[PDB]
Amino acid sequence: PSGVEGAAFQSRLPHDRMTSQEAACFPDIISGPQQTQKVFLFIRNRTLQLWLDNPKIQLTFEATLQQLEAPYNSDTVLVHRVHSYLERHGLINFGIYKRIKPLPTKKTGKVIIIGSGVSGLAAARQLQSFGMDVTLLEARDRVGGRVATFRKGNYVADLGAMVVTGLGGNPMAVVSKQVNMELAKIKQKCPLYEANGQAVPKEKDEMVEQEFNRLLEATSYLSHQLDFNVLNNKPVSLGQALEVVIQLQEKHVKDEQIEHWKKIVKTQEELKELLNKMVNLKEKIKELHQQYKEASEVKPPRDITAEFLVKSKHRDLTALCKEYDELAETQGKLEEKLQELEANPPSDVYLSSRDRQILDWHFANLEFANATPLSTLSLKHWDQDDDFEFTGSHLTVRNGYSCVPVALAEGLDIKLNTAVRQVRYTASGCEVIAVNTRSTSQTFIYKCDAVLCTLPLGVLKQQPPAVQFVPPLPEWKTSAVQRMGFGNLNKVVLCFDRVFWDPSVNLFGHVGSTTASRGELFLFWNLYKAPILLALVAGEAAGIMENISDDVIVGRCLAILKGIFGSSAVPQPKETVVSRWRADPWARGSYSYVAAGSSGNDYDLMAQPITPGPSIPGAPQPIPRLFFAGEHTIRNYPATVHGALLSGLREAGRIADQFLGAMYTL
């Protein structure tokens, strides 16, 4: 899309319909007359457009109304209502802009933000921009959290997020104009290489892949059409579903072979009967010729009965030769209608051991995508976010994604090396107790009106708790923490003094020997300006590799690589790094997934803020005090940077509405 409707789309909104969100702030308009809705929609779209066309400077109500025409710039309470909702909810003036009206004088309310993740930062910025008093508390000694970037000399590699999944309606697209990130595209071309170290022929490469995709839809069919969703009380995983399909595929392979030879027999046995009938005819015929011979020897002149005998047997014989000729006829047809059946057996196997191995790499890719064993993903929901796809080619950050959280960080009150330990929230405020990560006896107390919690889900799951809630989180919330999945995925950074891979190629896969190790070093990335190869560890493997030393790992790594490129095209690496996210105490994993027995709905639960009980009982129902953001909290953009970033914008909006009031819902 382009024009004004471009903006609506590039902002994740229907250009010609009002959202549930908007309904709530403009209930006057939407219950209103069709004509007004259209005016509204345009104003929105148009403002968005303006912001979008230039997101390096703040966009004021003046500057906005300024660029409008009648009939539109007629009503200005509308324009204000609109520009103001858009501002609040971070559709316009989010990220890094230049403020036209340097920040209003004294600040209102105070919020503690746990963790300077992207979700953390993006919210902090928003709040501060709304003139609130914001402090972030970070356990690590750097910002970004799961946006980690390795830097040393000229080597630059992300150990955390690394891919931008397309600019089409991606908030990061704005951010990218605001910050210098070199975005390189990802040539989707990816050659595979079996265990031996030999490329896989385009002939196979394509068979397997296509079968993979076929297998996927298959599961989708079992799910939605056959309703195969529970199974002796447990929910079905993608994993099960896949097996159950593969099995059925193998089954039908046999089913065919059976009824194919089962046809050969039924025919071979027709041939049998006919041959028997044929022998027993040569039998009569043999000994009936005898009789004609004997009766033909009686030399004439013969009387008439003896003449009749000759004449008669001679018919009776040519009669039986007719018969047997018609049978050797029939015989011939069947004998060839049998080289026919032996010529085209149906298929011998469903997949060879080499096939079913490559198919495994395709599953590894899927385990990588979801940071988890397919045995754990929900069948029904594993891909519930499947509509909200961005458009455009996927990209990478050529200069390390960290360039972003660092840029967001700028101008904010951040306490690094500060491990939150207890969150206490009550009717009249909250206090947060952190310690110093370096010397942990050294304690801190933070008082504030609201707490925004951007703790990773992994952290939130810890048993026993790394952070204590006072009072405890309601059971509706803590079940949503159990139920949800929090996966794992690990990277290996290989730094060299020379390129020795195909420079024209961004990614290439390695095919493991067993199902069990399909994830182990299954895929490599050539991404950066320096000679750095980056290798993945996904699936069941990632968890196990965390227990293995770095040398051993880089070992198995170089192996595989020599295996493909020749045992002396591959030098020792100058510099290596190995992530361990499930180990890392401020992550406890990589990003969330939709575990079997969860649904997208749990994500909505994660986002529901907490409202304490009353102080003096029988006093009025309080304000909500404890708020949540982070990749695990955004039903429609789970597990991503843009997703977090968005969840931050969300909560900031929600908190401002709460503590600064909403002048725009009038």
Partner: protein, 133 residues
């Protein structure tokens, strides 16, 4: 609507590979045997048939009789009439065979005969006697 084409998935099939923990490898193993079992029987009847083809060796070639190209005729020689009357006793109503035996009469000349001489060859009696066998 329909499973991707070339994938096979029956409602009924599914419940069958799930019934227990290894109804999976069970059902896949019946067929593995159900096969080698058909496949063995194929070689039995391959050999059984092969030995029968052994007997039919050389066909019926030495037993075939030369061609009788002889033209149909009006006259019933007394020879032909007797040949006829005996054919009837042996063949009943198979006017084709009867015609074939007398050599040179049309399949109808025969039926005609059946009504003309019916009289004096007691073809009634004759015919009911062919039945009595």
């Amino acid at each position: 609507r329909k499973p991707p084409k070339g994938m096979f998935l029956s409602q009924e099939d599914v419940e069958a590979v799930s019934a227990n923990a290894t109804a999976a490898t069970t059902v896949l193993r019946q067929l593995d045997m159900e096969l080698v079992s058909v496949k063995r029987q194929i070689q039995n009847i391959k050999q059984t048939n092969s030995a029968l083809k052994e007997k039919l060796d050389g066909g019926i070639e030495p037993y075939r009789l030369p061609e009788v190209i002889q033209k149909c005729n009006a006259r019933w020689t007394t020879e032909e009439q007797l040949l006829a009357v005996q054919a009837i006793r042996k063949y009943g109503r198979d006017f084709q065979a009867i015609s074939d035996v007398i050599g040179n009469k049309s399949v109808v000349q025969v039926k005609n005969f059946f009504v003309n001489y019916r009289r004096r060859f007691n073809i009634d009696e004759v015919l009911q006697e062919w039945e009595a066998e």
